[PDB]
Amino acid sequence: MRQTFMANESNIERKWYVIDAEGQTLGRLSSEVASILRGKNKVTYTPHVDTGDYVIVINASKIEFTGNKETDKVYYRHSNHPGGIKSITAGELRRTNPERLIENSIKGMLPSTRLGEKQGKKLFVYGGAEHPHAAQQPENYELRG
């Protein structure tokens, strides 16, 4: 007897959250956020529809590293031109454009499908303590760890 609930687009209700990346470790914040961008923390989780919530990371210039990672955590970016390999350390990438640091770390934990691409478009990283989306009325989340 086949009786398993599947979610539709007329079933799903996505809500908004705010994470504070202040005094947190990159990666350890990123995996917990990645699990929320997908509906993994929900019953009614269905794998062929998008059933996750929106996230906002606010401070994101206060993120932390543990080792000597800030001087040798190069990133490496090729450009498809002969000898066109480029480079930047993790330390200088959070000094300039800290938003691309966290965004890229979280998107690397999502599947590379047509649905993973759409799920990663709910991220909204900012540097500093304020964000524009007051009209969506987001709550705080308080990472589990």
């Binding site: 398993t4 993994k40 019953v43 989780y45």
Partner: protein, 58 residues
């Protein structure tokens, strides 16, 4: 899929799937993983009562 849904439902009562299934076995309950996740979807109170018995058997 059923195990993913049960795991999500158990974290809302501060348990992981692992310990919930251990406790349910020690309580003697023999409900499927397929039924355990349909209950958690349709009837939240019944699932709460299951969780309390699983907690008391540990």
């Amino acid at each position: 899929l059923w195990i993913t849904r049960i795991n999500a439902a158990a974290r809302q009562h501060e348990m992981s799937y692992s310990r919930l299934m251990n406790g349910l076995k020690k309580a003697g309950i023999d409900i499927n993983r397929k039924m355990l996740s349909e209950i958690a979807i349709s009837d939240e109170k019944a699932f709460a009562q299951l969780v309390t018995k699983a907690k008391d058997a540990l």
